């Protein structure tokens, strides 16, 4: 097949590591600073399961004052990475509100989505793996624990989302 564009959207509460995960996938660099996002775009040609693919990534705002931009990016977005931080239990509750809003504006029960539990490198957590696996299990979506700091699970999270989109297209 030809190299197609896949429109990935990274969503989640402020400071969960949406930008750090995208930057790690794009160029293998960990950003220690917190540079709050409004709305960034990334484009990169990668090979997934032997197929050349063009990743178009929208790295969105977690800050609540930018909430009005959500309806436009949710309509245009094709697949969604739902990111929460494993040491932030409010971000885990917020990730369920993103999941619901995506289904409302897109009017579909099966929009391609991957639940991502970020900051797995931290010595302690406030959201246990069983809680997150239980939530993704009820919605029939994959769940991957990641660390933008060590790169653990980063490629897996974005590539699993591409695979979810591939099945949804059919």
């Amino acid at each position: 097949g030809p190299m197609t564009e896949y429109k990935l959207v990274v969503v989640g509460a402020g400071g969960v590591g949406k930008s750090a995960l995208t930057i790690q996938l794009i160029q293998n660099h960990f950003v220690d600073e917190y540079d709050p996002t409004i709305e960034d775009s990334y484009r990169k040609q990668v090979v997934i399961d032997g197929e050349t693919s063009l990743l178009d990534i929208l790295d969105t705002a977690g800050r609540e004052e930018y909430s009005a931009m959500r309806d436009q990016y949710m309509r245009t977005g094709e697949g969604f990475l739902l990111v929460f931080a494993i040491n932030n239990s409010k971000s885990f509750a917020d990730i369920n509100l993103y999941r619901e809003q995506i289904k409302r504006v897109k009017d579909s029960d099966d929009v391609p989505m991957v639940l991502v539990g970020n900051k797995s490198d931290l010595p302690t957590r406030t959201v246990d793996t069983k809680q997150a696996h239980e939530l993704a299990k009820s919605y029939g979506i994959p769940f991957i624990e990641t660390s933008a700091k060590t790169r653990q699970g980063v490629e897996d999270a974005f590539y699993t989302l591409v695979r979810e989109i591939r099945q949804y297209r059919m």
Binding site: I26, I38, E39, D40, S41, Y42, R43
Partner: peptide
């Protein structure tokens, strides 16, 4: 390539 909010053009980030 990367385009920050408010930028007119894309810049290289994968070189």
């Amino acid at each position: 390539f990367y385009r920050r909010y408010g930028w007119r053009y894309w810049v290289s980030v994968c070189g």
